[PDB]
Amino acid sequence: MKVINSSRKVQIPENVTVDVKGRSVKVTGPRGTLSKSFDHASVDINLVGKKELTVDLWFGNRKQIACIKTITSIIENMITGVTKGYEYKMRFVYAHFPINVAVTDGGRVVEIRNFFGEKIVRRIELLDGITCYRNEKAKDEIVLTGNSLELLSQSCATIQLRSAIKYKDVRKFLDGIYVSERNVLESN
Amino acid sequence: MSHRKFEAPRHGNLGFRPRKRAARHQGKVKSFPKDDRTQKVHLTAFMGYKAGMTHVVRDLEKPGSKMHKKEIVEAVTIIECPPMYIVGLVGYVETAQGLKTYKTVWAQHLSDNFRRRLYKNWYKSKSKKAFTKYVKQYETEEGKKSIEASLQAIKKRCSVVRVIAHTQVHKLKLTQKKAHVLEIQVNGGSIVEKVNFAVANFEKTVNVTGVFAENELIDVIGVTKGKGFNGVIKRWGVRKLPRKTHKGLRKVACIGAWHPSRVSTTVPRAGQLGYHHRVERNKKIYRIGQAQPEDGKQISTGKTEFDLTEKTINPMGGFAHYGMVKHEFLMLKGCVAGPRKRALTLRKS
Amino acid sequence: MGRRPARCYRYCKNKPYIKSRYCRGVPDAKIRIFDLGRKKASTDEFPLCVHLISLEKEQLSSEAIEAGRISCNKYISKTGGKDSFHMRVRVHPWHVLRINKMLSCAGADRLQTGMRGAFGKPMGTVARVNIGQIIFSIRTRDNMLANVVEALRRSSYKFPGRQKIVVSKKWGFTAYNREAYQKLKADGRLMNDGANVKVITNHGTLAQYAKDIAAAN
RNA sequence: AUUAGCAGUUUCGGGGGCGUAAUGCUCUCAGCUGAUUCUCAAACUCUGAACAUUUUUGGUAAGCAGAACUGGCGAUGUGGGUUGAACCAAAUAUUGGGAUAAGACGUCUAACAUUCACUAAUAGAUACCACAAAAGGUGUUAGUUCAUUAAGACAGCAGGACGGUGGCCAUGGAAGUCGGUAUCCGCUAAGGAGUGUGUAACAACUCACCUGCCAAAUGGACUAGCCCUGAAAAUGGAUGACGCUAGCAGUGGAUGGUCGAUGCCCAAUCGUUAAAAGAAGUGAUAAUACUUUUAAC
RNA sequence: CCUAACUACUAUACAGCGAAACCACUGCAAGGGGAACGGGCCUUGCAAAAACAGCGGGGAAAGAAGACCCUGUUGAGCUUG
RNA sequence: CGCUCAUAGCGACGCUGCUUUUUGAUCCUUCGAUGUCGGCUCUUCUUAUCAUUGUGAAGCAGAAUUCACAAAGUGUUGGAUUGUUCACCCACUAACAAGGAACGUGAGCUGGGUUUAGACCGUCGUGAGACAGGUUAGUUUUACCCUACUGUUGUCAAUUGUU
RNA sequence: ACCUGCCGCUACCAUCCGUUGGAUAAUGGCUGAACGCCUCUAAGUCAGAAUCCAUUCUAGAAAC
């Protein structure tokens, strides 16, 4: 009816400093730092030494259990990312009407110019912290690197959403910018 | 029944619905543009006076529009805009249910506007003679201290402020021993500056040129032409029996129906069609008119090129009956609210 | 009845009418057939029986029944064939529905539409069933259970209300369970009847008997 | 009234196969007979039951119409169901106090605590009663049965996924996979003469099928609580309102406890009745057309 | 079409002059139940003296014991084999 | 069926609902009299959404169409004929979607029908007369009360300062 | 009577003027579980309606 929830432990590598002021994380690694908020579901969240954070709450339900699993997972990704920066590469698809993709390097803004006949200027400001760069792979691809996996991915998705044709057939065009090489990291 | 037509689009608008005799004899608005400007250069509002309409040929300014350089006529509302004499600075402070009158400050050099709202007032009369009893600023040295105290406090304490200005209608054609008082909320820069400079300006007198530039749009205000009580026909733009065989009326048929079993607000009825407020916007402003020191007239012609003469904007005969421009004025785009000799008001967009 | 919506009759009420020398003016039943698959199938080969039952007490229209039978007669073929289904339905429609017509009216009335001489005329033949009373029944081989339950399931849609599907514990169209069926073969009391079993039993309805074992054997 | 096949018949009915054809056998199909099977037949019955509730005829129904038994309402109210002619309690002389009934107890509004679950929904909130159904939900809770699992499971990811063989056909291409029919054997840890994607059909890839690792549970078909979907209509609106939600003041329980009728208990007062008494607290009066007592209402 | 203006006159204000029909009580609403469409009952929304001139939604407005229709062992006017 | 292919789009026999915009059934309400049908006028609301806003499916390549969600915010036409809603044509339009409000709306109108008397025919009647048959002509009263609305004064007929 | 007729009213029988922010629904995604995979959802979050609510405009309370 109401069942106890197992603790979910995670090892932390010695590259980083997970501090936890009142159930709310900050994980400082090589690439910089990411904070995040927790205590949505009233969960407990402890540090044992400084190579082991553990989440738990000793009564509840399936619902609570799931939440526990989630939070831990989220933090793991953050840990990974703030030590080794994440890379979401989005390749674009048009050469019948050719495509013009541009990038403001200063403000970290992609600007997609001409696709599917359009003469408009589609400027999508990237989310906080993340960046992009133009890369010569095969006269294609914008590579978006960042350390917050959640945010970078979201930004990419936004861009994808914005670069499609909201009237008439979804297969007359298959064109636009979409994600290609993801879950990718680096150590170079 | 369905209806059965479709259209019946609400004859009228329910956004002017109380359609009664307006509060202020002058143009008045309880709203202002917000803070992103310099300082006293941006005074926001001004007060003018209507004086009729003329037409002006100019060229268009639109490509692909019966030529961007071809001539078209348009009407214009010309409006005698005497310079104003700011005199109180007033500090609003922002609170749990909007803004309130914390405390004003007034200039020592002048207090004749006060007086002007007095001869036309009182009925027993204890304090007509020249005095007061709603608290006003007198005194050279002792009141100075008070003023100083006020000034700092408002400056420190919260929220934006306006200036008690007023018109000089004595020197206008129409004679009036009371003048029209107004607020011109001040925008931009910072509060310290804003509070400070009002004091400086008391003696000084602002010009319509001080507020607006010659290509700037207006937030125009006024009070509509006072036709007087009239029935539902041209108060809402209804219909009638054009071949005519009816013992009732020009007045409409159903007023609600046995529907909510009573009659609603939302029915056009017999009331009045005159002093109402309203605000029309985006008026181009075509030409700011110059002051006339009773000698020259090229100043109220405008250009000499294309104008090709020297004349006032005032007609051949001029204005012997109506508001005659001897002062600064304004050529707007055609039509403003209010009759030919009315106290308007202006805001910037 | 396809004229009416059958909401009108899906509650078992009013003492039950019939065809007779009293109710002559009836139409003919919709189903005049209770024969789905291989009727010439022996009792000693199809050891399974599944049943469908009306969960609810209610009437059960002839038309509805008919409709149901071709969820077990199209679906007879796609799954297995004729050599699996043996169906006797296990309900008929004796009961009749009347119709006091006022269709007469489509603009005005003659007043005979009113409740004077109210009593309706026969129109709609229908069955009456309790909750237990069985409504479909497939006697079959025991390699066909999920490919016959889905016939029953299909049928259930075409009945009003709630319908329960089941498998019994017998050889179908027999009293005797699968446990007591093997007895018959073993004890030499199995007597075939091309469909049924008579089951040989000693008894006495004579004067001095011994053919009561030696009759069918 | 009515469903099924079975058997025994066929010099009686019909048409075939068996010597030409039949009824000579054997068949499906007629008729008759015998044993079994389906539904039992308000006007059938061997047997045989103890406005409202219950029964019940007409009627698709109706706050329609027509009966039965009891109860009410109506010619009695009060408390309770928000309110309400009929439902609940329960019947009214007039009062006092005590304890109850139905109904409540976050607040309106007198009345509370404790305890276990369940619901997360624009909800859900006491008969009559102000509607909801068939049919869906990998929503959550609770169960039931069979299957699998240390002979190493489940999901995951990784490896393998063959020989005869291009199976025979159609084709002269269809070589597992436009497509017809058979659908076997070897060998192996395992592999359908093949689950699709793809291709001219193949090739290529994947699936069934197996195994590598990780390492303890897994899988499924149903039942049934609450919730959701289904679930649309006319002024602005209804658990009566507010409002409530992670124990709730919602639902379903558990253990006490409290409020509360003109009901009940007790007391008082007045009348009525029945019975009795007479100097009516009328102990000098001399009353019975009157007063009093006792009891019941 | 699409309404417009104008004058008379009444209305509108005054001065005199003064009226009726009608009137259980009375006049704010939503919803509920209730002789099933409430102003009053109930529960909510609310609420602000005294009034003016227009308007016609409501008062299941008013005028008329509906004569439409039925009934009563009520009549009449007329008709006929 | 839709080549093929149950559910793109439809959907048999069959089954469950909702609706009150059809008409019946009923006769609770009204015969101390709710003025009956339509049209004009005018608002309001409902959504069962025709258009448009934004979305998702399609047998959606484009074009146009079809299907569906959110959503009632804004539109929802001009005419012939008909007493007429209903009906049917012509023409526009993005579209000319269905409805509700005492079958919205008669002290708002009109009276074209339906509604008396006069009267023509046809059928019926021995006849006086009859007709959910046709034809024609036929007085539409009252707000100077309360409320509701519209605007117009005035007031906490002082909340316990004037102005 | 007719012509002409200012002032004045008035005509799609003329002229001028009709804004920008958040919040979302549907819905499309993200990260990511319950259910080692998966999944727009559960916790969480992004984009997003002629929609809502503000800004605008009208009126201005037995409100200051």
For chain B, the first-to-last Cα distance in angstroms comes to 46
| Nearest DNA or RNA nucleotide to A77 (CA to C1') | G31
Instruction: Please return the burial class of B300, using the count of CB atoms within 10 Å of its CB with bins 0-12, 13-18 and 19+.
Output: buried
Neighbours of B141 (CB within 10 A): 6
Q: What is the CA radius of gyration of chain A?
A: 20
With contact defined as beta carbons under 8 Å apart, do A98 and A83 qualify?
no
Neighbours of A112 (CB within 10 A): 23
**Among the listed residues C9, C73, C63, C59, the one whose alpha carbon sits nearest the alpha carbon of residue C31:** C63
The strand pair at A109-112 and B53-59 is best described as unpaired
With contact defined as beta carbons under 8 Å apart, do B331 and B286 qualify?
yes
**Among the listed residues A54, A40, A41, A38, the one whose alpha carbon sits nearest the alpha carbon of residue A6:** A54
| Residue-level length of chain C | 217
Q: Are residues B10 and B135 in the same domain?
A: no
CB B241 within 7 Å, strand E: no
C-alpha C204/C-alpha A25 separation (Å) is: 94
C-alpha C91/C-alpha C59 separation (Å) is: 11
In angstroms, how far is F158 C1' from C24 CA?
Answer: 93
C-alpha A96/C-alpha B156 separation (Å) is: 65
Strand E bases, protein C-beta under 7 A:
1-5, 28-30, 37, 39, 53-58
C-alpha C174/C-alpha A56 separation (Å) is: 62
Q: What is the CATH number of the domain that holds B75?
A: 2.40.30.10
CB B269 within 7 Å, strand E: yes
- HEC secondary structure over C4-62: CCCCCCCCCCCCCCCCCCCCCCCCCCCCCCCCEECCCCCCCCCCEEEEEEECCCEEEEH
With contact defined as beta carbons under 8 Å apart, do C155 and C162 qualify?
no
**Among the listed residues C163, C131, C146, the one whose alpha carbon sits nearest the alpha carbon of residue C65:** C163
- Label residues B123-136 b or e (16+ Cβ within 10 Å = b): eeeeeeeeeeeeee
Q: Are residues B91 and B186 in the same domain?
A: yes
Residue A79: in which H helix or E strand, if any?
helix A62-83
C-alpha A106/C-alpha A46 separation (Å) is: 40
Q: Are residues B160 and B202 in the same domain?
A: yes
The single-letter DSSP state of residue B49 is: B
* Torsion sign over Cα B273, B274, B279, B281: positive
Q: Are residues A132 and A75 in the same domain?
A: no
Q: Are residues A170 and A101 in the same domain?
A: yes
Q: Are residues A4 and A53 in the same domain?
A: yes
- Residue A35's domain comprises 1-85
Q: Are residues A74 and A45 in the same domain?
A: yes
Give Cα separations from B151 to B95, B142, B301 (angstroms): 19, 15, 44
Chains in contact with A via at least 3 Cβ–Cβ pairs below 8 Å: none
**Among the listed residues A108, A122, A114, the one whose alpha carbon sits nearest the alpha carbon of residue A161:** A122
C-alpha B210/C-alpha B66 separation (Å) is: 35
The single-letter DSSP state of residue A58 is: S
Q: CA B33: distance to chain centroid?
A: 15
Q: Are residues A130 and A67 in the same domain?
A: no
Q: Are residues A40 and A77 in the same domain?
A: yes
C-alpha B212/C-alpha B153 separation (Å) is: 31
In angstroms, how far is D41 C1' from A101 CA?
Answer: 88
CB B70 within 7 Å, strand E: no
Strand D bases, protein C-beta under 7 A:
1-7, 35-43, 56-62, 64-65, 117-118, 133-135, 140-142, 235-236
In angstroms, how far is D90 C1' from B341 CA?
Answer: 84
C-alpha B132/C-alpha B118 separation (Å) is: 9
With contact defined as beta carbons under 8 Å apart, do B44 and B211 qualify?
yes
Q: Are residues A93 and A81 in the same domain?
A: no
In angstroms, how far is F155 C1' from B230 CA?
Answer: 27
The strand pair at A133-134 and C58-61 is best described as unpaired
Q: Are residues B37 and B186 in the same domain?
A: no
How many Cα neighbours within 13 Å face the side chain of B22? Answer: 21
Structural domain ending residue among the three candidates A85, A116, A138: A85
Give Cβ neighbours of residue A158 (< 8 Å, ≥ 6 apart).
A124
The single-letter DSSP state of residue B300 is: G
In angstroms, how far is G62 C1' from B96 CA?
Answer: 22
Chains in contact with B via at least 3 Cβ–Cβ pairs below 8 Å: none
| Nearest DNA or RNA nucleotide to B271 (CA to C1') | F151
- Phi and psi for B298 in degrees, rounded to 5? -50, -35
In angstroms, how far is F70 C1' from A64 CA?
Answer: 33
With contact defined as beta carbons under 8 Å apart, do B230 and B273 qualify?
yes
Tokens of C27: 């139409």
Extents of the domains making up chain C:
1-174, 175-217
Token match 């048009």: residue? Answer: A94
Q: Are residues B336 and B290 in the same domain?
A: yes
Tokens of B277: 């407020």
SS3 assignment, position B5 = coil
| The one-letter amino acid at B187 | N
The strand pair at B329-331 and C95-99 is best described as unpaired
Q: Are residues B179 and B113 in the same domain?
A: yes
Token match 């609600």: residue? Answer: B256
Neighbours of A20 (CB within 10 A): 15
**Among the listed residues C135, C168, C139, the one whose alpha carbon sits nearest the alpha carbon of residue C40:** C139
Neighbours of C86 (CB within 10 A): 23
| Nearest DNA or RNA nucleotide to C157 (CA to C1') | F15
C-alpha B27/C-alpha B50 separation (Å) is: 11
| The one-letter amino acid at A40 | H
Q: CA C178: distance to chain centroid?
A: 23
Instruction: Please return the burial class of C186, using the count of CB atoms within 10 Å of its CB with bins 0-12, 13-18 and 19+.
Output: exposed
Q: Which residues pair with A91 in a beta bridge?
A: A178
Closest protein residue to F74 (Cα–C1'): B9
In angstroms, how far is D231 C1' from B53 CA?
Answer: 64
Structural domain ending residue among the three candidates A70, A85, A100: A85
C-alpha B230/C-alpha B22 separation (Å) is: 16
- Phi and psi for A80 in degrees, rounded to 5? -60, -45
Q: Are residues B88 and B191 in the same domain?
A: yes
| The one-letter amino acid at B190 | S
Helix axes B142-156, B191-201, angle to 10 degrees: 150
With contact defined as beta carbons under 8 Å apart, do C173 and C196 qualify?
yes
**Among the listed residues B296, B286, B334, the one whose alpha carbon sits nearest the alpha carbon of residue B50:** B334
Tell me how many degrees the CA angle B78-B33-B43 measures, rounded to the nearest 5: 60
Domain C175-217 has CATH 3.30.60.300: yes
Residue B276: in which H helix or E strand, if any?
none
C-alpha A186/C-alpha A188 separation (Å) is: 6
Whether residue C136 is preceded by a cis peptide bond, meaning omega within 30 degrees of 0, is: no
- Phi and psi for B57 in degrees, rounded to 5? -90, 135
CB B249 within 7 Å, strand E: yes
With contact defined as beta carbons under 8 Å apart, do B184 and B197 qualify?
no
Structural domain ending residue among the three candidates A85, A115, A150: A85
C-alpha C184/C-alpha C171 separation (Å) is: 12
Residue A159: in which H helix or E strand, if any?
helix A149-162
Residue B181: in which H helix or E strand, if any?
strand B181-183
C-alpha C195/C-alpha A109 separation (Å) is: 83
Q: CA A38: distance to chain centroid?
A: 18
Give Cβ neighbours of residue B159 (< 8 Å, ≥ 6 apart).
B91, B92, B93, B94, B99, B191
Tokens of A174: 């298959």
CB B75 within 7 Å, strand E: no
Give Cα separations from B69 to B59, B60, B66, C45, C196 (angstroms): 5, 6, 8, 103, 107
CB B69 within 7 Å, strand F: no
**Among the listed residues B83, B296, B88, B109, the one whose alpha carbon sits nearest the alpha carbon of residue B172:** B83
Q: What is the CATH number of the domain that holds A22?
A: 3.90.930.12
In angstroms, how far is D61 C1' from C60 CA?
Answer: 19
With contact defined as beta carbons under 8 Å apart, do B45 and B185 qualify?
yes
| Nearest DNA or RNA nucleotide to B234 (CA to C1') | E3
Conformation bin of residue B211: beta by default, left when phi > 0, alpha when psi is -120 to 50 = alpha
SS3 assignment, position A73 = helix
The single-letter DSSP state of residue B198 is: H
C-alpha B191/C-alpha B199 separation (Å) is: 13
- Looking at the 3D structure of chain A, how many domains does it have? 2
Q: Are residues B91 and B157 in the same domain?
A: yes
| The one-letter amino acid at B37 | R
- Assign a CATH topology to domain C1-174: Aldehyde Oxidoreductase; domain 3 (3.90.1170)
SS3 assignment, position B212 = coil
CB B60 within 7 Å, strand E: no
User: What is the per-residue DSSP string for chain C?
Assistant: --SS-SSTT-S--S----SSSS--S----S-----EE-SS--TTT--EEEEEEESS-EEEEHHHHHHHHTTSSSHHHHTT-TTT-EE--S----EEEEE---TT-SS---STTSSTT--PEEEEEEEEE-SSSEEEEEEE-TT-SHHHHHHHHHHHHTSSS-EEEEE-SBSSSSSSBHHHHHHHHHTT---EEBTEE-------SSSS--HHHHTT-
Instruction: Please return the burial class of C127, using the count of CB atoms within 10 Å of its CB with bins 0-12, 13-18 and 19+.
Output: buried
Q: What is the CATH number of the domain that holds B20?
A: 4.10.960.10
* Torsion sign over Cα B306, B308, B310, B316: negative
Q: Are residues A131 and A54 in the same domain?
A: no
In angstroms, how far is F81 C1' from B237 CA?
Answer: 32
C-alpha B203/C-alpha B293 separation (Å) is: 21
C-alpha B219/C-alpha B343 separation (Å) is: 15
In angstroms, how far is F37 C1' from B141 CA?
Answer: 89
| Nearest DNA or RNA nucleotide to A183 (CA to C1') | G31
SS3 assignment, position B55 = strand
Give Cβ neighbours of residue C178 (< 8 Å, ≥ 6 apart).
C47, C169, C170, C171
Q: Are residues A11 and A93 in the same domain?
A: no
With contact defined as beta carbons under 8 Å apart, do C52 and C157 qualify?
no
- Residue B186's domain comprises 83-206
Q: Are residues B219 and B328 in the same domain?
A: yes
C-alpha B112/C-alpha B177 separation (Å) is: 10
| Residue-level length of chain B | 349
**Among the listed residues B76, B57, B45, the one whose alpha carbon sits nearest the alpha carbon of residue B332:** B76
Q: Are residues A93 and A186 in the same domain?
A: yes
C-alpha B165/C-alpha B187 separation (Å) is: 16
Q: CA B281: distance to chain centroid?
A: 12
CB C5 within 7 Å, strand F: yes
Q: Are residues B142 and B255 in the same domain?
A: no
CB B231 within 7 Å, strand F: no
With contact defined as beta carbons under 8 Å apart, do C167 and C50 qualify?
yes
CB B247 within 7 Å, strand E: no
In angstroms, how far is F54 C1' from A165 CA?
Answer: 14
Token match 């994808």: residue? Answer: A160
**Among the listed residues C205, C159, C153, C195, the one whose alpha carbon sits nearest the alpha carbon of residue C39:** C195
C-alpha C113/C-alpha C128 separation (Å) is: 29
Give Cβ neighbours of residue B124 (< 8 Å, ≥ 6 apart).
none
Q: Are residues A154 and A168 in the same domain?
A: yes
Instruction: Please return the burial class of C17, using the count of CB atoms within 10 Å of its CB with bins 0-12, 13-18 and 19+.
Output: middle
- Label residues A123-135 b or e (16+ Cβ within 10 Å = b): ebebbebbbbeee
Q: Are residues A187 and A156 in the same domain?
A: yes
CB B242 within 7 Å, strand E: yes
**Among the listed residues B192, B222, B228, the one whose alpha carbon sits nearest the alpha carbon of residue B77:** B222
The widest CA-to-CA distance across chain B, in whole angstroms, is: 80
* Torsion sign over Cα B227, B230, B236, B238: negative
CB B234 within 7 Å, strand E: yes
Give Cα separations from B61 to B28, B71, B214 (angstroms): 32, 10, 15
Tell me how many degrees the CA angle B337-B343-B344 measures, rounded to the nearest 5: 45
Tokens of B231: 């029935």
Structural domain ending residue among the three candidates B177, B206, B235: B206
With contact defined as beta carbons under 8 Å apart, do C146 and C121 qualify?
no
Helices (H), chain B: 112-119, 142-156, 191-201, 208-211
**Among the listed residues B151, B253, B277, the one whose alpha carbon sits nearest the alpha carbon of residue B202:** B151
